[PDB]
Amino acid sequence: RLATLLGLQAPPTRIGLINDMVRFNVLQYVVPEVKDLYNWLEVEFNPLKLCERVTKVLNWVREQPEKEPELQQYVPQLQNNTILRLLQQVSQIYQSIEFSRLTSLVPFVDAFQLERAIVDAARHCDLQVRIDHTSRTLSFGXXXXXXXXXXXXXXXXXXXXXXXXXXXXXXXXXX
Amino acid sequence: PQVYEELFSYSCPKFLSEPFLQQLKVFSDEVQQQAQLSTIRSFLKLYTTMPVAKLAGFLDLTEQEFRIQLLVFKHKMKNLVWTSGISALDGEFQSXXXXXXXXXXXXXXXXXXXXXXXX
Amino acid sequence: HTYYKFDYKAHQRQLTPPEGSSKSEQDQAENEGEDSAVLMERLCKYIYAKDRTDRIRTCAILCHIYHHALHSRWYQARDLMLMSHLQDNIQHADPPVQILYNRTMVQLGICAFRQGLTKDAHNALLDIQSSGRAKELLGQGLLLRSLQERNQEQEKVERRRQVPFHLHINLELLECVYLVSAMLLEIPYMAAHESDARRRMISKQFHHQLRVGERQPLLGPPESMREHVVAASKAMKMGDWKTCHSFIINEKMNGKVWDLFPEADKVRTMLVRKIQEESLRTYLFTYSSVYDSISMETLSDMFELDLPTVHSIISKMIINEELMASLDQPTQTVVMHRXXXXXXXXXXXXXXXXXXXXXXXXX
Amino acid sequence: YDLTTRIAHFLDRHLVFPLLEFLSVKEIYNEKELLQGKLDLLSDTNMVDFAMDVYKNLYSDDIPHALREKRTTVVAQLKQLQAETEPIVKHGFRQEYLDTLYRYAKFQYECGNYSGAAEYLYFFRVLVPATDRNALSSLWGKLASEILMQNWDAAMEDLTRLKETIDNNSVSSPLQSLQQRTWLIHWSLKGRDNIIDLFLYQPQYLNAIQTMCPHILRYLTTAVITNKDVRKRRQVLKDLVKVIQQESYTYKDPITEFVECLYVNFDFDGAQKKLRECESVLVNDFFLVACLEDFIENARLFIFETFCRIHQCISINMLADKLNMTPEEAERWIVNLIRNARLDAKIDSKLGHVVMGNXXXXXXXXXXXXXXXXXXXXXXXXXX
C-alpha cells in the first residue's frame, strides 16, 4: 500500500529506480566511483574481470571521508547483488564446475558463506543447482536424463534463433 | 517346513479319507515339496552380486545342509530363480520391455476407472 | 513467610526471630545438619494427615514442592508431586492454593529448564501457558485496576487474593523460557515439513506469533522479546546459528530475561550447544533438496559440532524419518534426492484401504 | 558402588544375605564387605547353616553362644508349633490350622529349611477360607520360597494360579508384585521378549518385596534394548521411551536412562561404553549375572544392524578406527555374530571392507506396481 501512499503510480523495479539515478542531476553530484561501479555491475559485467575492477575501485571509497561513510552502510546488500550476479553468470558459463573453482571465482567473506549464498540464490530461483559434497562439484542443471533435457533446451534455443534469422533474411531478400 | 510337516502329521486322518486307493498319501507329499520351493524363488534374485554367507544362512533353513551348494544350483536348473557366478572361484553369486510393462499398468488403471464409472 | 525466599534470607529471618526470643523454649523439632531443610520438612510432615484437611495438607505439600524446586534438586520435587497425588484437590481450593498449584508448576518448569531439559519443560508448562489470562492465573495483577472493578468492597476484599510481588515471579522470564523451548522443539519438525518428508508432526510454542509477523505489512528489527526469539527462529531456518544465539541476547537484554537466573553463564553455553544441534538438524532438513552429497568434516567445523555428534544426529534422524539418505562412515559422506517403485507400492496400499472403507458403507 | 546402600536398598532377606554372599563369591573371595555384612546380618536371625558357613573361613569367626541359643530356641519353637498344630487339627477351626501351616512355613523359612517351608506353606491350600486372601497369599509365599530355591517354573505356575484366580482388584499392586515375579521368572528362563514386557508394564509405587526399584529399571531397560527380534520401534519407542510410568523407575538409575537414550539416538559407541562401565557392577547382580554377556552382545548386534542396513558399502577398517572401540575387537565380534545369522554382513577382515545388500531391479519395482494394481482390482470386484 505504501508505494501508492508515496504518490508513486505503481511499485517500481530496481532498474526503473536506477534510471532516475541514471539521470544527470543524481549523476552530476554523484561521486565518480559509483558511476564506475554501475558500469562494472550493471553495464558490462564480466566475471573474469569483475574482481579486479572492484579491487581497484574499493580502495578509493575507503580513503574518502564522505564516500566511505555512504559506502560503509551498504556493503552487505551491494555484496549480495554482486555475488548473485556472479552465481547467475557462472550458471550460464558452466554445467558442472568444481566447488573450489566456483567459490574461488567469486570473492566471499568465507568459503561456507559463499555456499550459503549459492543456495539462497537457488531457493529464490535465480539459479538451479545440485551440489555434490562428495566430489566437491556443483551442477547447474538420472545423469543421462539431465543431459537429455539440457540438450532439448539447447535445441529449442537454436530453433528460436534460426526462426528469428529467417525473418531477417526476408528483409535482405528485398535488398 | 517344520510347521508344514507337522500339519500333515496331525491331520493325517483327513488325507487318508479307499485306504488302498490312497495307501501312501502320494499327492499331498508332492504338493508340499512344490510348496517348500516357492519362498526361495520369492527373493527372486534382483541382486547383481550376492554374498555367499547370506545365501548360506537362508538355505541353511532348508533341511539339507549341503543343499545350497546343491540346493542353490538345483534352483537354477528349475529356472524359477536365476543365479549368476555360481560355482565360481570367487564363490559369490551374481544376479522397450520396461515401456511395455508400464503401458500394461496404465491399462489396468484405466480398466479400474471404467468399472468405477460404469458402476 | 519462608518458602519463596532463599535459604540465606530464611535463615536470617529465623536467626533474627530466635535472637528476640527468650533462651528457654519448647520445640518439638530436633536440630539437624541442615537447619532450614529440616524446618520445612518438619512442618510439612506435621501438616499432612488423614484427619487433616486437604486445604491445609495440600497447602503444606505445595509449599514443600515450591521450596524444594527452588533450593533442591528437581527430581526430588517431581517425585513429591507425583507421590502426593493431588489432581482434583490442587485446583480447589485452599484460597491461596491456586497460586501454589500454578506457582509450583511454574517453578519446576523453571528449574527443569535450568537443568537444560527442554523436552521436560515444554511438557510441564503447556497447560498453564496456554492461558491468555495467565498473569491473573498466577495471582499477580495490580490491585488498583481490579479494585475499581471488584467494588463494592464487601465482595471485593475476598476477591483480591492475588499474591505479593516478592512472591510473584516475572512473566517475561517464564514466557521467554517456554518460547525458547517450543522453538528448539518445533523448528526442526517444521523445517522437515517444509522439506515435506512429513514423517512426524510437531507443535512449537509462539508459532502463531511468528505467522502473524510474516503476514505483517511492516517488519521491524526486533524490539520486544518475542521478536528477538522470532529472529533467532528465522536465523535457525536459514542456518545461521551464530545470528540466532546473538538475537536471543538482544531480545533478552531489553527483556532482562536471562539475567534473572544465577547460573546464566552455564545456561548460555548449554543453550548455545543445544541450539547448535537443533540448528544443524534444521539446516540438513531444509537443504537436502539441492544437495545430493555432504561432508561431515566441513559440517562439523562450521556448526562447531564435533563429528561424533553430527553423524549421530543425522543418522538417528534419517532412520527415524525414513529419509532416503545414505551415509558412508568410512569416507564420512552423505547421499540424498532419490525409491519411486517403493513409493508407488505404498500409494497402492492406501488406495486399497479406501476401497475397503467404501465397501463398509455399501454394506 | 557402595555396598551399604545396595544391601540397604533391597527389602528381601534373601537379597539382603544371598546378594552379599553372591558379591563375595561372585567377584573376590578376599574383599571384606561381602563377608562382614553377611556375617553380621546372618547373626541377626535363626539360620545356623548360613551362620555355620560364616563361621567357616572367609567368614566371621565362629561363636559358641550364637549357635547354641539359636539351635535351642528352635527346638523349643518346633515342639510348641507341633503341639499347637496337633490341637488345631484335633478346635476344628480352619483359620487356626491355616495359621499353623503358615507358622510352620515361617519357622522353617527363617530356620533356612526351604523345602519344608514350601511344603507347609502350600499345605494351607485346603484350609483357605477364601482364594483371594488365603490362597493368593499362599501364592506370594510359594513364590518367595520358589525364587529362593531357584525354580522359576514353579514361580510362573503360582503366578498363573494367582492371576488366574477369579477375584482381582485393580487398586492393589499385588498385580505389581506378580508382574515382578513373572518378569523375574522369564529373565531367569534369543531374547525372551517377555521379561521386558513384564518389567515395563507397571510400578506399584509400593515396595517391590521381590524386585529392587533399581532392579526393575535396569532389568526392564536392558532386556528391552536387547530384544531386536521381538522389539517394535514402539517397543524401543512405545514401551520404553514414550512410557511415562516406567520413567519413574528409570530416573532411579540414570546411567541406564542415558544408556537407552544413547541407543535410541543412534550413538551406539556411547551406549556400549556405558555398558562396558557398568559391566563389573552388573556381574555382581544375583539375577542378572548369568545373562549379562548375552544381553550386551545382542545390543551390539542390534547396533551393527542399524549401521549395517543404512549403508550399502562400509569401510570396515575406518569404522574400527572410528568406532571408539578397537577395530580388531570389532571385527572379531562381527565374525562371531555372523555365523549365528544375526547379521547379513558381507565381511572380509583382511580387506577391511564390508558390503551388505538388502533389469532385475527395474523388474522389482514393476512387480510391486502390478501387485498394487491387483489389490485395487479386487476391491472393485468386491464393490460390484
Numbering used by the authors:
A (entry chain A): 354 to 494, 1000 to 1033
B (entry chain L): 406 to 422, 438 to 515, 1000 to 1023
C (entry chain C): 299 to 636, 1000 to 1024
D (entry chain E): 4 to 93, 121 to 219, 227 to 395, 1000 to 1025
Copy out sentences from the published article reporting this entry, exactly as the authors wrote them.
Many viral internal ribosome entry site (IRES)-containing RNA elements require the presence of eIF3. The recent structure of the 40S-bound CSFV IRES in complex with eIF3 revealed the structural basis of this interaction, with the IRES RNA occupying the eIF3 binding site at the 40S platform and creating a secondary binding site for the PCI⋅MPN core (Hashem et al., 2013b). Because IRES interactions are also mediated by eIF3a/eIF3c, we were able to model the interaction by fitting the eIF3a/eIF3c heterodimer into the 43S⋅IRES EM density map without any adjustments. This fit of the eIF3a/eIF3c heterodimer places two loop elements (between helices 2 and 3 of eIF3a and helices 1 and 2 of eIF3c) important for IRES and 43S binding (Sun et al., 2013) in close contact to two extrahelical bulges conserved within domain IIIB of the CSFV and HCV IRESs. Consistent with our model, these RNA elements are protected from RNase digestion when bound by eIF3 (Sizova et al., 1998; Sun et al., 2013). Based on the convincing fit of the eIF3a/eIF3c structure into the EM density, we attempted to dock the recently solved paralogs of eIF3e (CSN1) (Lee et al., 2013) and the eIF3h-eIF3f heterodimer (Rpn8/Rpn11) (Pathare et al., 2014; Worden et al., 2014) into the eIF3⋅IRES EM density along with older models for eIF3k, eIF3m, and eIF3l. Using the previously identified positions of the various eIF3 subunits as a guide (Querol-Audi et al., 2013), we fitted the models to agree with features of the EM density. The proposed arrangement defines the molecular interactions within the core subunits, with the HCV⋅IRES, and with the 40S subunit. Remarkably, even the helical bundle structure recently proposed for the 26S proteasome lid (Estrin et al., 2013) fits the remaining density after placement of the PCI and MPN domains, suggesting that it is a conserved feature of the PCI⋅MPN core of these functionally diverse complexes.
